[PDB]
Amino acid sequence: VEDWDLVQTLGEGAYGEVQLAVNRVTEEAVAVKIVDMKRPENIKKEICINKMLNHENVVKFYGHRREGNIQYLFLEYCSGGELFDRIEPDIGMPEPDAQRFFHQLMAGVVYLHGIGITHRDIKPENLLLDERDNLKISDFGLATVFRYNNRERLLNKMCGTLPYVAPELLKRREFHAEPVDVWSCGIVLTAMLAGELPWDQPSDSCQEYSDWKEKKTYLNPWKKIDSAPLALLHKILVENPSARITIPDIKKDRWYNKPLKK
Ligand SMILES: CCCn1nc(C2=C(N)NON2)nc1C1=C(N)NON1
């Protein structure tokens, strides 16, 4: 119903819904996120961050119109759905698939970090798959600038999703953006490799979290994992963000570089 027709709802959420839209003439498909500014400050921030983005592992932004209160963000259609739907509960997925998705995730994250954007809500629901199963980072609704004119700014707002959030964001008034995305990348890796999340939140008041810091890897996310990716997970899920491995160093890790897939 906007030069394009809207054909199936594709997802419905808080702000609004995402529809699949076609040209009835050219036949080109795209997704359109539909936010009712009544149901404005922050959709403005989202489209603004979107206009900066151009990368093969980031959902393409095509444009925006206003049409009443109704913003329509026109976005790359990802016909493979969500990474979340390739993770079999209690099982995960074959290790070579997990590794390729992890490579593509790191490529997307290094890119955002390079232009000073942090996504702040990396999780499998926000990692979409295209026609050839290429992973694309999706939904910049919580995204923000953490570097500008080459100067870093610390974050203070708590956001994201509790099982994915780094412990510093619950403990510190201000914290660096990049290690928080790294950590959330490690929780996604765990989910791909075990088919379960290790804890509700990285709090000292969380038993499963305490067990991990005590290195009880004979318990039940970790026991399904396998020594090579587990060793990478030991470097990512480090409580102190200044000792946590960085992306250039993840690129040097042994499992990250292990040949697995045809
Ligand atoms: C299950 C919802 C699917 N979804 N969600 C989004 C999206 C949201 N929810 N916020 O920004 N972008 N975008 C999509 C989507 C795209 N971008 N292509 O197919 N589906």
Swiss-Prot record:
EC number(s) given by UniProt: 2.7.11.1
Location of this chain's protein in the cell: Nucleus; Chromosome; Cytoplasm; Cytoplasm, Cytoskeleton, Microtubule organizing center, Centrosome
Domain of life the protein comes from: Eukaryota
Catalytic activity line of the entry: L-seryl-[protein] + ATP = O-phospho-L-seryl-[protein] + ADP + H(+); L-threonyl-[protein] + ATP = O-phospho-L-threonyl-[protein] + ADP + H(+)
One GO process term, biological-process aspect: chromatin remodeling
Domain Protein kinase: 4-256
Active site residues of this protein: D121 (proton acceptor)
Enzyme class: transferase
A single MF term (Gene Ontology): protein serine kinase activity
Keywords, ordered alphabetically: ATP-binding, Cell cycle, Chromosome, Cytoplasm, Cytoskeleton, Disease variant, DNA damage, DNA repair, Isopeptide bond, Kinase, Nucleotide-binding, Nucleus, Phosphoprotein, Serine/threonine-protein kinase, Transferase, Ubl conjugation
Region (Interaction with CLSPN): 1-256
Binding site for ATP: L10, G11, E12, G13, A14, Y15, G16, E17, V18, K33
Known tissue expression: Expressed ubiquitously with the most abundant expression in thymus, testis, small intestine and colon.
Chain residue numbers at which the record places covalent cross-link Glycyl lysine isopeptide (Lys-Gly) (interchain with G-Cter in ubiquitin): K123
Post-translational modification: Phosphorylated by ATR in a RAD17-dependent manner in response to ultraviolet irradiation and inhibition of DNA replication. Phosphorylated by ATM in response to ionizing irradiation.
Regulation: Activated through phosphorylation predominantly by ATR but also by ATM in response to DNA damage or inhibition of DNA replication. Activation is modulated by several mediators including CLSPN, BRCA1 and FEM1B. Proteolytic cleavage at the C-terminus by SPRTN during normal DNA replication activates the protein kinase activity.
Impact noted for substituting K33R: Abolishes kinase activity
Principal location: nucleus
Entry similarity comment: Belongs to the protein kinase superfamily. CAMK Ser/Thr protein kinase family. NIM1 subfamily.
Subunit details: Interacts (phosphorylated by ATR) with RAD51. Interacts with and phosphorylates CLSPN, an adapter protein that regulates the ATR-dependent phosphorylation of CHEK1. Interacts with BRCA1. Interacts with and phosphorylates CDC25A, CDC25B and CDC25C. Interacts with FBXO6, which regulates CHEK1. Interacts with PPM1D, which regulates CHEK1 through dephosphorylation. Interacts with TIMELESS; DNA damage-dependent. Interacts with FEM1B; activates CHEK1 in response to stress. Interacts with TLK1. Interacts with XPO1 and YWHAZ. Interacts with CDK5RAP3; antagonizes CHEK1.
UniProt note: domains: The autoinhibitory region (AIR) inhibits the activity of the kinase domain.
Functional summary from the UniProt entry: Serine/threonine-protein kinase which is required for checkpoint-mediated cell cycle arrest and activation of DNA repair in response to the presence of DNA damage or unreplicated DNA. May also negatively regulate cell cycle progression during unperturbed cell cycles. This regulation is achieved by a number of mechanisms that together help to preserve the integrity of the genome. Recognizes the substrate consensus sequence [R-X-X-S/T]. Binds to and phosphorylates CDC25A, CDC25B and CDC25C.
Disorder: Oocyte/zygote/embryo maturation arrest 21: An autosomal dominant, female infertility disorder characterized by zygote development arrest due to failure of pronuclei fusion.
Protein name in the entry: Serine/threonine-protein kinase Chk1
Source lineage: Eukaryota, Metazoa, Chordata, Craniata, Vertebrata
